[PDB]
Amino acid sequence: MDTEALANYLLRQLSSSQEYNKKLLLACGFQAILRKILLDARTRATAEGLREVYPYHIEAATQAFLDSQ
Amino acid sequence: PWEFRKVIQAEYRERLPRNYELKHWKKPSKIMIGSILRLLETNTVSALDSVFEKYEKEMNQMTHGDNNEVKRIYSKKERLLEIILTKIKKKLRQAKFPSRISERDLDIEYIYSKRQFIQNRYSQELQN
Amino acid sequence: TDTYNSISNFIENELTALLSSDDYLMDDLAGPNEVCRLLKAQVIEKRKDAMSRGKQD
Amino acid sequence: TTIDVLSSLFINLFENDLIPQALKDFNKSDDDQFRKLLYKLDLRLFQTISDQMTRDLKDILDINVSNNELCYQLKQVLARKEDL
Amino acid sequence: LMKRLIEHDLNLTLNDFSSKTIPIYRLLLRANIITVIEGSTNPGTKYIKLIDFNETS
Amino acid sequence: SIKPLQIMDLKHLTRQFLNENRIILPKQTWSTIQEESLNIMDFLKQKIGTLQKQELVDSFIDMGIINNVDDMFELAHELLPLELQSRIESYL
């Protein structure tokens, strides 16, 4: 499932070429949010020592992220 | 106070934190207008029913039992309420609010029915 | 049986809606208008987080 | 805050534009009862509409959070039922 | 800049690239033939060099 | 339903990122991030409703992700195929 499929998801959520580029940049930003959140989740899991992450880890990470945003 | 945009901007600046960037201002879409007019129509119907039930005796003694004048004034106040509804519709059509609100996000009947259903399920689970 | 819906429905019908309607009608019929609107304003003001659905629940 | 600014808009509009206008109309019509009680029931209409606006918006927000709280209570009840 | 890249200059960074050479650097980055690593001694300065095209490890 | 995404969509989306950088996701974490994708999309649409040139890069600077347009088309380099990042570079 490519990034263009996520752009299709976003356009069907909101419903030419320049708006396609805008939505593609939006999909890239969404992937950046997910990657940063998962990186914070691993950082906190390694801080606690657990090999995997858990829902409370990533909930705390995303609350700390949205606190700054 | 008829200047809706200034009050909207002042209340958005007052009721939000200072780091909340309101960069994007959007006019209310047609579904917002439909939901607002539906809520206003239902609440005006309920209000006029309550008023005419509460003040029926003075209305009857002043008209000496003439129900035709009662219905004529009911129609006149209905016309006035519809005129005011069109006026406030025109005033909100020149307004700004984020487009995150849908029809299901603002409707009394749907949320009330959902609350009734979840309360019935809660009581049934408590019974079991 | 269904005791909990009966309790909650009895509260939300005969306890808060009846109280609001009776207070409004009695304040309207006490005399007058501006007096009633103002008094309703502060009694609504000080009853915050007390008549909410969380409190009845 | 969108519900809050909508409530503030309705409060300002009814409390400063329509209710004082109909109150002045009610005070003006001293010669004839018939227009006088017309303006009085107009005051009834606008004031009940303003109160209904505020109560309905606060009730929308309150039921929107109370439904989540009741859902949490329902999940707790289901867990206790499973353990039982 | 190309001569510094071929000779594998260790002082190459993003500072010597002008605004006109920014599309050229983007073309080079799209080739995936350069290492983009931020300097530990000077954060914010991305040290740039080509990957080794001759190794037989 | 129609607006929430699926679990397999998230596997196909971020499976390689959890593989190159070693991440282990149990099923509860998968359901949690499936729930969180909706909140992230709502927050992104609340922050950016309409799309024009300067506001998106200003918001992404405000997002704390980037510092310039160079970071924009370098982050697009690591998240897009070659034709799409070339098209974005032609757009920026």
From Swiss-Prot, chain B:
This protein's record includes keyword rRNA-binding: no
UniProt subcellular location: Nucleus; Chromosome, Centromere, Kinetochore
Organism domain of life: Eukaryota
One GO location term (cellular component): kinetochore
Keywords: Cell cycle, Cell division, Centromere, Chromosome, Coiled coil, Kinetochore, Meiosis, Mitosis, Nucleus, Phosphoprotein
GO biological process entries: attachment of spindle microtubules to kinetochore; cell division; meiotic cell cycle
The keyword Nucleus appears for this protein: yes
Subunit and interaction comment: Component of the heterotetrameric kinetochore subcomplex COMA, which consists of AME1, CTF19, MCM21 and OKP1. The COMA subcomplex is part of a larger constitutive centromere-associated network (CCAN) (also known as central kinetochore CTF19 complex in yeast), which is composed of at least AME1, CHL4, CNN1, CTF3, CTF19, IML3, MCM16, MCM21, MCM22, MHF1, MHF2, MIF2, NKP1, NKP2, OKP1 and WIP1. COMA binds the centromeric nucleosome-binding protein MIF2, and to the outer kinetochore MIND subcomplex. OKP1 interacts directly with AME1, with an NKP1-NKP2 dimer, and with CTF19-MCM21.
Family recorded in the similarity comment: Belongs to the CENP-Q/OKP1 family.
Name this polypeptide is given: Inner kinetochore subunit OKP1
The organism's taxonomic lineage, starting at the top: Eukaryota, Fungi, Dikarya, Ascomycota, Saccharomycotina
Residues of the full protein shown: 127 to 254 of 406
Swiss-Prot record, chain C:
Superkingdom: Eukaryota
Subunit-level organization: Component of the inner kinetochore constitutive centromere-associated network (CCAN) (also known as central kinetochore CTF19 complex in yeast), which is composed of at least AME1, CHL4, CNN1, CTF3, CTF19, IML3, MCM16, MCM21, MCM22, MHF1, MHF2, MIF2, NKP1, NKP2, OKP1 and WIP1. NKP1 interacts directly with OKP1 and AME1.
Similarity-based family: Belongs to the NKP1 family.
Record's subcellular location: Nucleus; Chromosome, Centromere, Kinetochore
Species: Saccharomyces cerevisiae (strain ATCC 204508 / S288c) (Baker's yeast)
Protein name: Inner kinetochore subunit NKP1
Task of the protein: Component of the kinetochore, a multiprotein complex that assembles on centromeric DNA and attaches chromosomes to spindle microtubules, mediating chromosome segregation and sister chromatid segregation during meiosis and mitosis. Component of the inner kinetochore constitutive centromere-associated network (CCAN), which serves as a structural platform for outer kinetochore assembly.
From Swiss-Prot, chain D:
Function description: Component of the kinetochore, a multiprotein complex that assembles on centromeric DNA and attaches chromosomes to spindle microtubules, mediating chromosome segregation and sister chromatid segregation during meiosis and mitosis. Component of the inner kinetochore COMA complex, which connects centromere-associated proteins and the outer kinetochore. COMA interacts with other inner kinetochore proteins to form the inner kinetochore constitutive centromere-associated network (CCAN), which serves as a structural platform for outer kinetochore assembly.
Name used for this protein in its record: Inner kinetochore subunit AME1
Family under the similarity heading: Belongs to the CENP-U/AME1 family.
Record's subcellular location: Nucleus; Chromosome, Centromere, Kinetochore
Residues of the full protein shown: 133 to 216 of 324
Additional note from the record: Present with 1630 molecules/cell in log phase SD medium.
Swiss-Prot record, chain F:
Factors inducing expression: Levels are constant throughout the cell cycle (at protein level).
Transmembrane domains' residue ranges: none
Statement: the UniProt record of this protein carries the keyword Nucleus: yes
Keywords tagged on the record: Cell cycle, Cell division, Centromere, Chromosome, Kinetochore, Mitosis, Nucleus, Phosphoprotein
Self-association state and partner proteins as the record states: Component of the inner kinetochore constitutive centromere-associated network (CCAN) (also known as central kinetochore CTF19 complex in yeast), which is composed of at least AME1, CHL4, CNN1, CTF3, CTF19, IML3, MCM16, MCM21, MCM22, MHF1, MHF2, MIF2, NKP1, NKP2, OKP1 and WIP1. Interacts (via N-terminus) with the outer kinetochore NDC80 complex subunits SPC24 (via C-terminus) and SPC25 (via C-terminus); the interaction is direct and contributes to the correct spatiotemporal organization of the KMN network. Interacts with outer kinetochore MIS12 complex subunit NNF1.
Identification of the protein by name: Inner kinetochore subunit CNN1
One cellular component (GO) term of this entry: kinetochore
The organism's taxonomic lineage, starting at the top: Eukaryota, Fungi, Dikarya, Ascomycota, Saccharomycotina
Phosphoserine PTM positions: 1
PTM info: Phosphorylation of the C-terminus by MPS1 kinase regulates interaction with the outer kinetochore Ndc80 complex. Phosphorylation levels rise from S-phase and through metaphase, the protein is thendephosphorylated in anaphase.
Family from the record: Belongs to the CENP-T/CNN1 family.
One GO term (biological process): cell division
Molecular function (Gene Ontology), one example: protein-containing complex binding
Other information: Present with 1300 molecules/cell in log phase SD medium.
Subcellular location: Nucleus; Chromosome, Centromere, Kinetochore
